[PDB]
PDB file of C-alpha atoms and ligand atoms in Angstrom:
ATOM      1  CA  UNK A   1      43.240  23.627   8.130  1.00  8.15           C
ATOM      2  CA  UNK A   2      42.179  22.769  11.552  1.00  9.37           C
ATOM      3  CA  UNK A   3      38.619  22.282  13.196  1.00  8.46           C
ATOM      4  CA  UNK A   4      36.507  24.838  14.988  1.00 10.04           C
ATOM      5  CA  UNK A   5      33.486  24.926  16.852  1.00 13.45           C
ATOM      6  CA  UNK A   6      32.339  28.899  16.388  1.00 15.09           C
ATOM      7  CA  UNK A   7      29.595  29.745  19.048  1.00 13.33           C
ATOM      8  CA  UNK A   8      27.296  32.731  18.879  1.00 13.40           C
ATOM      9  CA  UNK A   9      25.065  34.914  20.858  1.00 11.64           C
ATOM     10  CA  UNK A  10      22.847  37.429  18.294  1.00  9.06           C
ATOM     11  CA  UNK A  11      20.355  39.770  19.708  1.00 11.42           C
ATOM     12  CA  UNK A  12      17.344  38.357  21.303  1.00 13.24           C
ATOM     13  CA  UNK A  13      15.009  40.812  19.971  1.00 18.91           C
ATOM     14  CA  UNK A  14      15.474  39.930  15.983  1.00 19.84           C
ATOM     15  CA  UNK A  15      12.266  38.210  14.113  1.00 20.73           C
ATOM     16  CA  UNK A  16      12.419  34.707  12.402  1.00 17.30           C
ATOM     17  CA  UNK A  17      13.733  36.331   9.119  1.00 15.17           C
ATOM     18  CA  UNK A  18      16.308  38.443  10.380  1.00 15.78           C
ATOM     19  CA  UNK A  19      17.599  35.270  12.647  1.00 15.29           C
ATOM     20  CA  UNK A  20      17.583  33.448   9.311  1.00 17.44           C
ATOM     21  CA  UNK A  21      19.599  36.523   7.617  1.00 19.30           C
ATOM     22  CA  UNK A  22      22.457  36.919  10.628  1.00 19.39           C
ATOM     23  CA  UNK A  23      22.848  32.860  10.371  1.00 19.11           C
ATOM     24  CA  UNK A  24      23.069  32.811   6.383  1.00 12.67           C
ATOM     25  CA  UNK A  25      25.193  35.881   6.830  1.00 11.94           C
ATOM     26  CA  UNK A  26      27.556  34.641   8.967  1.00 12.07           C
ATOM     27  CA  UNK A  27      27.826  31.460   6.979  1.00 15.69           C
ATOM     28  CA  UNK A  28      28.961  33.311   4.184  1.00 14.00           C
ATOM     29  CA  UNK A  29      31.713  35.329   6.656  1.00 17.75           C
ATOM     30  CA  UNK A  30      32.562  31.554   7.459  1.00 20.25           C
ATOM     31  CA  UNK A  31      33.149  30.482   4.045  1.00 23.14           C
ATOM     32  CA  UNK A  32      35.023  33.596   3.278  1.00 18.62           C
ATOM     33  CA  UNK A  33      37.665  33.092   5.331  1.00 20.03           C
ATOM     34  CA  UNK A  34      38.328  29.710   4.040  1.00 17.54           C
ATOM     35  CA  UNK A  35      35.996  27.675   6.319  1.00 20.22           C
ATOM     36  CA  UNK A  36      34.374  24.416   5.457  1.00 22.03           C
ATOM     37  CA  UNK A  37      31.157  24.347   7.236  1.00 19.41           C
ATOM     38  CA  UNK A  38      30.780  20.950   8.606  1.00 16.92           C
ATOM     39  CA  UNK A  39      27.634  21.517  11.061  1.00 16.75           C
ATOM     40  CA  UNK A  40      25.544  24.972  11.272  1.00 16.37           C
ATOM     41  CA  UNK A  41      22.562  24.838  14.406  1.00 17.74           C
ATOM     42  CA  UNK A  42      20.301  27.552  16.056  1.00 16.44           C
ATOM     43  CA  UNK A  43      20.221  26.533  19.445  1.00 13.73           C
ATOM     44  CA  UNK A  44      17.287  28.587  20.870  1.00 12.52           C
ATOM     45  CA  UNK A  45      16.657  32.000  22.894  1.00 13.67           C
ATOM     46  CA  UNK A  46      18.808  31.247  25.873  1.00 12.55           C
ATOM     47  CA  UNK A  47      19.421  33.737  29.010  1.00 13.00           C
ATOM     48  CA  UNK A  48      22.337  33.785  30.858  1.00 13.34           C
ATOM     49  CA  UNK A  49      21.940  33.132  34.464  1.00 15.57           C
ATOM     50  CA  UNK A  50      25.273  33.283  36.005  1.00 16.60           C
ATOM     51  CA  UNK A  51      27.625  34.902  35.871  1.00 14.69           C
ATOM     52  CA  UNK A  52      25.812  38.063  36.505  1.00 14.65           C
ATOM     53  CA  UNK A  53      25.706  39.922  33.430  1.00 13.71           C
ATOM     54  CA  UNK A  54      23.568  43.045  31.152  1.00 14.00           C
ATOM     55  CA  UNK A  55      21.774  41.894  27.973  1.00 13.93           C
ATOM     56  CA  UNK A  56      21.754  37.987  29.424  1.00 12.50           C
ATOM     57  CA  UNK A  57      19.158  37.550  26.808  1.00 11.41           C
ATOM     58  CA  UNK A  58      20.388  35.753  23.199  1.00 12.48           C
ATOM     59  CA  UNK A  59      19.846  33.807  20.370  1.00 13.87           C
ATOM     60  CA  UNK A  60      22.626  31.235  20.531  1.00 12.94           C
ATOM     61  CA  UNK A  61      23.959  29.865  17.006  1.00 14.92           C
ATOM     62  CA  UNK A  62      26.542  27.563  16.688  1.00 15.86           C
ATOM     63  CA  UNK A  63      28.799  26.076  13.365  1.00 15.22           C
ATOM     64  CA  UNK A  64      31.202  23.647  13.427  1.00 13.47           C
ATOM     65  CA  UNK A  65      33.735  24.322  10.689  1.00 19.38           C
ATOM     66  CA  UNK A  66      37.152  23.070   9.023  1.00 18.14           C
ATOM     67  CA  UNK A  67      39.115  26.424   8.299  1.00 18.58           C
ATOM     68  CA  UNK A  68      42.450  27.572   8.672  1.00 20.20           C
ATOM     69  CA  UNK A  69      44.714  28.719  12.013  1.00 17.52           C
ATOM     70  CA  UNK A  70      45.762  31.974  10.361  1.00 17.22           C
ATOM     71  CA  UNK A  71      42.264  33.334   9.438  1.00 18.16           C
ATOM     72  CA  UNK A  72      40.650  32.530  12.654  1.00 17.48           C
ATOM     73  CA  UNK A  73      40.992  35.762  14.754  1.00 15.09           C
ATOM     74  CA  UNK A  74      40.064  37.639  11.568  1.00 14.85           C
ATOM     75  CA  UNK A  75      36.854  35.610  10.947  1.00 15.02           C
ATOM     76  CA  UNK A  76      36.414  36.258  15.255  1.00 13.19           C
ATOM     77  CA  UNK A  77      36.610  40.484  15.140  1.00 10.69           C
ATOM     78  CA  UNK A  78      34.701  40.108  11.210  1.00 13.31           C
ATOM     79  CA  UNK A  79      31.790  38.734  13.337  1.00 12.95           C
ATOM     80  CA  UNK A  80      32.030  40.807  16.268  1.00 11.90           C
ATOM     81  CA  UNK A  81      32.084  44.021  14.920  1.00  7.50           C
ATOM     82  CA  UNK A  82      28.377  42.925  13.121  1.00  5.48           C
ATOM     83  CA  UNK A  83      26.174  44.820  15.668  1.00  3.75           C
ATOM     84  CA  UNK A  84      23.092  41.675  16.228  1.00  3.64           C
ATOM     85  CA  UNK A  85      26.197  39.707  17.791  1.00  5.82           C
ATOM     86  CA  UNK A  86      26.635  40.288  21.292  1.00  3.36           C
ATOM     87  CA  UNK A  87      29.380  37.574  21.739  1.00  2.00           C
ATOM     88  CA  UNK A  88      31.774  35.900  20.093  1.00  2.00           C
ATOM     89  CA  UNK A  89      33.382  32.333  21.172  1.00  2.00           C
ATOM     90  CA  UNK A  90      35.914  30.147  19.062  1.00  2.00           C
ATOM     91  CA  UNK A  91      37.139  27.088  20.536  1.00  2.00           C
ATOM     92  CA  UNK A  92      39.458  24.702  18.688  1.00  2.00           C
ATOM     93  CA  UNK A  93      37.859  21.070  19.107  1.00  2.00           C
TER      94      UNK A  93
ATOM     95  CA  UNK B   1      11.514  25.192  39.451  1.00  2.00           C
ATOM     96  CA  UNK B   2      12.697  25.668  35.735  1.00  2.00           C
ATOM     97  CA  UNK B   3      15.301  24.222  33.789  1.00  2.00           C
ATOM     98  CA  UNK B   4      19.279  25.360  33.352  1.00  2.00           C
ATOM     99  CA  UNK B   5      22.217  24.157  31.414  1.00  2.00           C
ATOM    100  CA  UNK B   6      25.269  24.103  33.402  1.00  2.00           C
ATOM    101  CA  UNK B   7      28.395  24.257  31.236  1.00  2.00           C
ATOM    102  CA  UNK B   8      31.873  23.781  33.454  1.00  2.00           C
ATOM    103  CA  UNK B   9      35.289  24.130  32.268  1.00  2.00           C
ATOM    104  CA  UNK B  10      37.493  21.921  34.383  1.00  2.00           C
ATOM    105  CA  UNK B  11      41.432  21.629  34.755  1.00  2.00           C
ATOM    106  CA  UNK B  12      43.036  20.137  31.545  1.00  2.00           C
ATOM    107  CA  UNK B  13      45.595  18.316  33.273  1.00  2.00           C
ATOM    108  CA  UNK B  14      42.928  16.179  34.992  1.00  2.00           C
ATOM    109  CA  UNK B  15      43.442  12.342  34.647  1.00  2.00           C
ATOM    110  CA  UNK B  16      40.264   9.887  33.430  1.00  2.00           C
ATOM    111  CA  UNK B  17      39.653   9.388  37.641  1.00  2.00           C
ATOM    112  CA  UNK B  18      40.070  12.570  38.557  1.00  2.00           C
ATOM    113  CA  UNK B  19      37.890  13.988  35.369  1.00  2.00           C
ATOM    114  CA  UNK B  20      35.104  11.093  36.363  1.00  2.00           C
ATOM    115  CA  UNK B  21      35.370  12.087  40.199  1.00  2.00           C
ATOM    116  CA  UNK B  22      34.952  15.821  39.103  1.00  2.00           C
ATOM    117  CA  UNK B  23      32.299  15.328  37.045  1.00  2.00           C
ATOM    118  CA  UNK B  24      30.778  12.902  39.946  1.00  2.00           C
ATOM    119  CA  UNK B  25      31.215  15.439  42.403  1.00  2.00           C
ATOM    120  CA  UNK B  26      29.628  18.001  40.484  1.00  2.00           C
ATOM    121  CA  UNK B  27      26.691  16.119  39.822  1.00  2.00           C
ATOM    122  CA  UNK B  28      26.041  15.711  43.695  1.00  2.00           C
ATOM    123  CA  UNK B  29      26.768  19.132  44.227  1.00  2.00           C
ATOM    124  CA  UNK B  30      23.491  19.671  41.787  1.00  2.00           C
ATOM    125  CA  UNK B  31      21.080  17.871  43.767  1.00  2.00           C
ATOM    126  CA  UNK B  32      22.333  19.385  46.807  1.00  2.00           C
ATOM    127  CA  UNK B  33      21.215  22.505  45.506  1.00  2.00           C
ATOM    128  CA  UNK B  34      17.922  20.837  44.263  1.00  2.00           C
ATOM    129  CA  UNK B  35      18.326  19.816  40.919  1.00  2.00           C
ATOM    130  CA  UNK B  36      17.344  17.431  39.088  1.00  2.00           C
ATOM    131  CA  UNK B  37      19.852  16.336  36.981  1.00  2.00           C
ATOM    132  CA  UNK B  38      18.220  15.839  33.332  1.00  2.00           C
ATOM    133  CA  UNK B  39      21.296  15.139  30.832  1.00  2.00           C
ATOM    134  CA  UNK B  40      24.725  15.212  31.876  1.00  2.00           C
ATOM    135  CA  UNK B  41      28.026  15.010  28.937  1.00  2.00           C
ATOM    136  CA  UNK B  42      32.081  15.234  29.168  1.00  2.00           C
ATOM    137  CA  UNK B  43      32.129  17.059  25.445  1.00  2.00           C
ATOM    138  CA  UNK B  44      35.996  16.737  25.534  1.00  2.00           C
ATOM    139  CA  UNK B  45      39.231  18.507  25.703  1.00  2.00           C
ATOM    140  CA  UNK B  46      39.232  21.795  23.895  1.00  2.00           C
ATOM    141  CA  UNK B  47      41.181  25.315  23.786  1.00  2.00           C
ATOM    142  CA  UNK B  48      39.435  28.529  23.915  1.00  2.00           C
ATOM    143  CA  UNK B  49      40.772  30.167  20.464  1.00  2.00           C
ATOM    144  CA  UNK B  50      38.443  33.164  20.572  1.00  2.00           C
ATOM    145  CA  UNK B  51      38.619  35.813  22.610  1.00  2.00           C
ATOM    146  CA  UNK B  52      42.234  35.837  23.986  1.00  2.00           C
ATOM    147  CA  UNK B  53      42.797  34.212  27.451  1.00  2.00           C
ATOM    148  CA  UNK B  54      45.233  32.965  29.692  1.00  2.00           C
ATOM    149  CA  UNK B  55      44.646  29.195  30.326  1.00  2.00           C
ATOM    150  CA  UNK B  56      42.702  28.678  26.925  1.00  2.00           C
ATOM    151  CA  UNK B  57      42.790  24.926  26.930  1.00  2.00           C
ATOM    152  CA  UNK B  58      40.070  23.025  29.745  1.00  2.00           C
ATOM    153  CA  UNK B  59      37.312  20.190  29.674  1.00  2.00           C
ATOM    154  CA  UNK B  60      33.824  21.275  28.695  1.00  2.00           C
ATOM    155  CA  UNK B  61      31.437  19.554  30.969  1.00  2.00           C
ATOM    156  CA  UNK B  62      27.518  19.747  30.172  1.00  2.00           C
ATOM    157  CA  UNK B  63      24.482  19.241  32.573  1.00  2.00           C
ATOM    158  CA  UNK B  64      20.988  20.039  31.915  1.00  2.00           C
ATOM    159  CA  UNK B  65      18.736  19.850  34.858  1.00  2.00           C
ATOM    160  CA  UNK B  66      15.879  21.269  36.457  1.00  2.00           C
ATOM    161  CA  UNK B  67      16.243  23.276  39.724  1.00  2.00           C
ATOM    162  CA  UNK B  68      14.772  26.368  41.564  1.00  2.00           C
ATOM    163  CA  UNK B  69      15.702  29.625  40.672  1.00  2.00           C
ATOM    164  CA  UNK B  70      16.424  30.490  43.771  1.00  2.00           C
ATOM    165  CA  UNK B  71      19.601  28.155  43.796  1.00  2.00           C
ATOM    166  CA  UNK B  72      21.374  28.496  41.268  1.00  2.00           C
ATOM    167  CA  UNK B  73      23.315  31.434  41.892  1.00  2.00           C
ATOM    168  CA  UNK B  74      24.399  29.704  45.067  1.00  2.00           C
ATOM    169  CA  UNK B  75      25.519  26.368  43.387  1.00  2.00           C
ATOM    170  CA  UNK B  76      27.256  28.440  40.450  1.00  2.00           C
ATOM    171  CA  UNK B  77      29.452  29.642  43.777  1.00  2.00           C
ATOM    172  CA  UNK B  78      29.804  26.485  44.902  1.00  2.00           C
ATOM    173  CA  UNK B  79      30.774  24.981  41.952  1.00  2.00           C
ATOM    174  CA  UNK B  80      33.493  28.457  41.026  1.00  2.00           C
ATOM    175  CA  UNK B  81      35.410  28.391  44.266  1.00  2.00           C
ATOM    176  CA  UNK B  82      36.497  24.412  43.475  1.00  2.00           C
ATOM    177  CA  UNK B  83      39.899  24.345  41.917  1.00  2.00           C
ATOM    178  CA  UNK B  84      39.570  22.239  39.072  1.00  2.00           C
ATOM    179  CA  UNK B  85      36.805  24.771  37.797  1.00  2.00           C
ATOM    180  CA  UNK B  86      38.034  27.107  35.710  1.00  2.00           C
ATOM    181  CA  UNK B  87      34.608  28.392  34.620  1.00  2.00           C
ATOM    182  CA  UNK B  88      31.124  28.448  35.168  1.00  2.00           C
ATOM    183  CA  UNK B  89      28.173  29.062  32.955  1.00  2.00           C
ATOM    184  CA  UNK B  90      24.607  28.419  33.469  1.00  2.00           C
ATOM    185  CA  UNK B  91      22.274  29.262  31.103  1.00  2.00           C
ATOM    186  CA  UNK B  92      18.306  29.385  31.457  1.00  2.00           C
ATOM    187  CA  UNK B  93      16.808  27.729  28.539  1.00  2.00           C
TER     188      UNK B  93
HETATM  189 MG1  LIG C   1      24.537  18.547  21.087  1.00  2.00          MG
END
């Protein structure tokens, strides 16, 4: 077990409930790959202004979790593949 | 005017003074451009896990200010071409 800080970027264009959905969604996805989920926050609809970039528009989520090494580039490409996230960022606190 | 967060990824092998003088540095480099500088945080040493990169591990520095639009592509430059930055981010709340 080791401690993460999992950062997300879901489409901009999804309604209250379907933000609420993604984030309990991805919870779950969390959890199922052995993560304790210390700290879970929605951060806001946030544009990217540099670098230059298409779809700079996002909803950026954020969970800070306890889970193990092994399963973390399998929980990464789990959440990736879902199509309302546009990016993906792990970093190990 | 409007307001940005500027997240910076500096050197990891960076002492306390040279981390401080950085993040000094940096700050001026803000107002240069016309910002005001809001909020300003050193969230620690971390390694990107997720997605694969060379050089995952760096210091994730955090401002939040208020500057014109027209500026911040030039001070995201700025800020790139110094050595200790390995990676710029600014983000229009
Ligand atoms: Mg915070």
């Amino acid at each position: 077990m080791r401690r993460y800080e999992v950062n997300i970027v879901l489409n901009p264009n999804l309604d209250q409930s379907q933000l609420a959905l993604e984030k309990e969604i991805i919870q779950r996805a969390l959890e199922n790959y052995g993560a304790r989920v210390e700290k879970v926050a929605i951060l806001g609809l946030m544009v990217l202004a540099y670098p230059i970039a298409k779809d700079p528009q996002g909803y950026f989520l954020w969970y800070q979790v306890e889970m193990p090494e092994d399963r973390v580039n399998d929980l990464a490409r789990e959440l990736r593949i879902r199509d309302n996230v546009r990016r993906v960022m792990v970093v190990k606190s």
